[PDB]
Amino acid sequence: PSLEDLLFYTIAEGQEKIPVHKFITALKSTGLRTSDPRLKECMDMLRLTLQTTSDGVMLDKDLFKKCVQSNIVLLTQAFRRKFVIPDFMSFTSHIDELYESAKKQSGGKVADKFSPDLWGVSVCTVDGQRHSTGDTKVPFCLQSCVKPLKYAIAVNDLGTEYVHRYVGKEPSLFLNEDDKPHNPMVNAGAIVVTSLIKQGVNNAEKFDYVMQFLNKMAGNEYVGFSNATFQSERESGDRNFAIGYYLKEKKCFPEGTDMVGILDFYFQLCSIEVTCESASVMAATLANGGFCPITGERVLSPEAVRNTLSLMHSCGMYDFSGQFAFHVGLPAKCGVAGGILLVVPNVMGMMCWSPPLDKMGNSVKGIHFCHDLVSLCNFHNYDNLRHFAKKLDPRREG
Amino acid sequence: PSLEDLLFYTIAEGQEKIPVHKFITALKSTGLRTSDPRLKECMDMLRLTLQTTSDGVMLDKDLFKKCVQSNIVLLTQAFRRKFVIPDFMSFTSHIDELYESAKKQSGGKVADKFSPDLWGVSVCTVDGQRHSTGDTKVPFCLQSCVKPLKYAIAVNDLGTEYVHRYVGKEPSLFLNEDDKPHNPMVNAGAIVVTSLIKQGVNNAEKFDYVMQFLNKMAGNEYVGFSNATFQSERESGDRNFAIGYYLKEKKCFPEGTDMVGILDFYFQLCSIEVTCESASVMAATLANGGFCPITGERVLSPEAVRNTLSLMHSCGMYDFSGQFAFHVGLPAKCGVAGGILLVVPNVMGMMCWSPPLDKMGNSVKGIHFCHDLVSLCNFHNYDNLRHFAKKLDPRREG
Amino acid sequence: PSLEDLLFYTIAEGQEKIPVHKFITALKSTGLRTSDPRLKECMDMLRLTLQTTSDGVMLDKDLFKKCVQSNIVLLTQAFRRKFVIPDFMSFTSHIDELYESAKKQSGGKVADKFSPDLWGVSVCTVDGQRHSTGDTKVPFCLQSCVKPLKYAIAVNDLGTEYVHRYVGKEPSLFLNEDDKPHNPMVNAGAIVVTSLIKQGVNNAEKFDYVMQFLNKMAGNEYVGFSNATFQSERESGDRNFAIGYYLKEKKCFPEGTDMVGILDFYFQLCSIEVTCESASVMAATLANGGFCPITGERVLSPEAVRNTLSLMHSCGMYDFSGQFAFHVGLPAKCGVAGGILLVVPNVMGMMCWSPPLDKMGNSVKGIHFCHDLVSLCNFHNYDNLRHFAKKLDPRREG
Amino acid sequence: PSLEDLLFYTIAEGQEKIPVHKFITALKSTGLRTSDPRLKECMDMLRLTLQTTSDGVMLDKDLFKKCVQSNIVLLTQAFRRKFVIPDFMSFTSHIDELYESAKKQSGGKVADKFSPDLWGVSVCTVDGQRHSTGDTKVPFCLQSCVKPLKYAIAVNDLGTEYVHRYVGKEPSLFLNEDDKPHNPMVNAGAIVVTSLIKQGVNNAEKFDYVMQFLNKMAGNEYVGFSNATFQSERESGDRNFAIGYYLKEKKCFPEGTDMVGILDFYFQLCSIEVTCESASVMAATLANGGFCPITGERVLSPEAVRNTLSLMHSCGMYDFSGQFAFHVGLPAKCGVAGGILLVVPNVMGMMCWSPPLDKMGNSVKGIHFCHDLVSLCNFHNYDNLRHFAKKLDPRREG
User: Fold this and answer.
1) Rounded to an integer, what distance in angstroms lies between the CA atom of residue D378 and that of residue D380?
2) Which of A228, B152, C85, D50 lies 20 to 30 Å from C137, alpha-carbon distance?
3) Which residues in chain B have Cβ-Cβ distances shorter than 8 Å to A296?
């Protein structure tokens, strides 16, 4: 018996007392962060114990048991290498290799304010393991990356049926044969989707509803808002105004939709800010069936998550979608600011961010990273989990 | 140390001798078939032991181990319930229920010859577990179902880069903007793919080679040829001759291709016969990373299997591909014979066969079953493996 | 010698005095109207002569010569049967038949205001000969019928080269590959054309200018404006706003176009009013090479008249344009109020008006008429003028 | 009276006799050729006189009446300037100038055998006036130019309603929405049209039925057949077999149609040979309401000649049809050998020939000519016959 104690002899080398930093280094290598919310109680009790004790703060069996008894379940999984990527220490070295090789990719043209030398990669696994390399804490806008997220919110609140009364499920002209936009990843679809979220309420409260929803998936990491970007998208969004009026003409919005107001809302949502780190948790929530991996909170119905990953796969890269789903085989969404919201189902989320776009408007370093990643690891949607050639499988040991 | 001995008392309740029927029963319930090629040695050693005496043979530790020792790796994996679906008996009960529901769907138009009340479904898991129900042993033609298999052969022999010099990878007019056919799931793509398989050799031996390949994928289960279908497809292949001549004009074939002969080959390949059972093993090879699960032989390269599963996802249902990959989320291919080649990556392959077709040319019961299957079990491409709502997961116990 | 005298005995059968009504009757029978502008001096001279006595006021050679000498060329051309249709009294009998056969056509749905039983036809030959039958003096709106006229204006003021930097000349999605609207008969094209008329000056004066121009083409017959139509067209021009924003994003307008203003103008232009009679003179000006046939003043350059007639042929019926150019072979534009602007080059212009439209939005009676017209008379663009089968040729005697 | 005598003093300057050569030069100047079939009798009687009076001829009134009394109608019309283009001698000056200006355009690629500096234009008016300059007696194949003619033949024998069951009449995909080819000027339409001409008979007599027909419209001038070309069009007619099988699939041909034998007929018709001269009469018959101008024989119904001219206008220049119909406005058809069958309705027919094609496959020198021609003369479809700015009008004198 004695769970908290089983752990205790695992981290102490058949010794009497664990040094506090040694437990912390043991914890940090599992990829978890000490700032992890599922660890607060443990980590508070740890700071308080350093506080009520002497300088050479060392934890005996009984004191270790006191701090860890509150989060022993997660702490046990973390230390028994039961997390989805057990040798997380090695995996992140490869993510570094992938980052550096993707960094030497110099091409591309920034949309038109940011520097073409920003290049950030954040990883968040379905179990909470974090890794980052490059400029991962800079705020940028989701832009078209918000489209999966707000479609998820719509489906989570209204169900696959209702949302898909107003938008289709097939890649793409503005409307398909049923006089609905083809799919919610294209602008015409996103605008109708935006017209479903929190109807009746006004755009100020709508925007807060989606803001708090994104906060839940980001594990309460940074979800911001660039009003500066908002002004530009609404001043030079002539293309979207075209879509808005056309949608209005073909009666695509729900009953009583203030079309010009839905467009302003829509311009706001494209202007929501994230960092690589915060958004990689958002991705990971989609990877994790709707449960935010660093909180354990259910944020999205599995219905909603499955749908969003589905359409991200078939419609998230626009015309490149067939090519991208062929070589990468991961659901992903792209953004003019240079972000790739990338989901490896059941394993992890990622955000890549390099502001230089390629000819198709996808961050060059992102796309190069995404290819490189699936080259290396058997994460392609149709790699075998048993016979995966010479690819490495992060999910296994030895 | 006693590998085969550990198994002995697992099957005999701390008793002296195991009746031979009890072991067989215990095997059949593991999902495996006594006729499994990977058990051939052991089943011969039992055919031998049943000769020394014509009375209910009881096997002691020494003589049991004498038969089981040649197949002990695979035999304990089954009895320790290590297979991809551990409780395989329960899982076939739901397959029966799913088969019965779809059987009540009497809609559909048979192409025009078969009988509209035939209906078989067959399962072959990645580990060789097999269940069938319905008319699983009647030969029917692959028709378009053959397109992923012969694509796979092409890429297996010539690789992604070469095969995709002649055909594209995105869903659909006959050519795309690069002057290649859109993808190998459509006739124009199928025809070009046919023209890559064993160039230089002639059409009689080409067809033998594909046939040897198709035998490998079915673990040497039933593959046949319906000449009657073959004459139909050539006598009425007016659209196909058009596609061929157009392909000839736009120089889509490789150097020195006899297009009018390539069409015959193509009509041959569509006329290949399978049954549910044999085809379910084929699908299962694509389920299993390219290893035929009932023989263990590597039949198709991971590269070839991945690509084939990719293009089935995006192009295997044609227009219905978005609709279908949204709700069902499994790579499939249909054929006018009534066949749905179904693949559940990493779990199993299937063939569904009911000749009544809907207005899209897909098996009515086949489609209904596919939908029920993902309704019931978390096999959808983008279900979570951890949070999957009230869906059942056959990969787990209890 | 003695022209005015030569005419004199032509009207008096070897007699001394001509009863003034008898000249009037002989005038009206050549087709001209006593209100004809080219006859105003003579009619002033006759009002004076009818002022000196109140008793039939017969005219001798001296007083007749005193009235008609100011308009003797036109008058002898009428009485010496030099006009484009000489036996014009006959020709209007057939226009009455055509009017009647077509009044029996009951189909159609009025767009949504008017009454479905209004039906007028107006003819004005290139020589000023006038005929009407039915409700030819009710004001209605041109709607899209205005699109040839304002295209004619643009080309007249800017020439073909300039106008066709901004719009194309082929039938049809909004833009062509040159990112110009397809042709100025489609709404996207009309809007671009609208933005070229009198750039710089504001929308109140731009409207005046087009109005002055429309006056020149109707020979100062009725042109009005329906603010009722105007507010409706702008309240519900959602599709036109969609088009306006799209054209703005694709940079289709000239530099410095207030696009939401150009739409307003456009709605104004569509709300302009004509009667059958006034619009038939407008048609007749395009019929007569750019000279208003009832005033003789050059309104439009031969360049502009040619381009307009050309684009009405190919683009004026939208979808019906091939069917119509095949069977009817007369350049025409249609309007949702029920207007068919008809042009028989070198012979006459015409207006038909019945508010009931068919499914393609063309006046039912209008279209039946146009087909009937070309059944009867060799006006089809590719009828022969020498061997026209059994068709009637109004251009000839006997 | 005596029309012959009135003609007689018109050539003789109030003098006793007419030198036979003076009458001949006066006749040739009107544009007629002495070989004109309508002049056969006159010219026979004339040659017989030179034999009967081997002096200096010189015909007195009685003798001139004896030669001309048989063709007096045509002969006076020629000499009283009654022909459609009365000052024909000056008109040919312009054709020569137009020819020389078009001769300096050396651009273009000959399709692939002929020489790039071959350039002939040949005119035949509706009245029989001839003029040619350059290589007008070299044989070349109609190629696509036969399409208007064989369409005309179809509608001659079977009428508008019937032919257009099987083919549409709107410009361009291989079929349209009605599953008929779009119009008889594209291959898809021409191949169906071919399958309507003289059904039931076999290809050997069908080709003589069409050949005797072309001979009539060419006034029995050269109509030949290149069996040389005919091999080329069938060896490399892959696209045509594409179209053929597709049309067979969609049952576009009439009941009991040998599609492979229609394709063979079709290749023959494309290989028929003409010269500029012989084909210029062919065009002219279309300009003349179906009457071959140099014979007076009615070769085609007016219904048929209308239809053909209509579709030449809208579909005869393929994608260039709208541009061409805008700037040139004449019905014309182009051919890969370098021919432009060109009709100026009611005025003349004409054939142009330069083998260098432009990017669109149209005789570079022909197209330049066609533009130069309508620049010069008010022959554009929507030119005014009364107000035509700086253009010349050959239909007038002075």
Assistant:
1) 6
2) C85
3) none
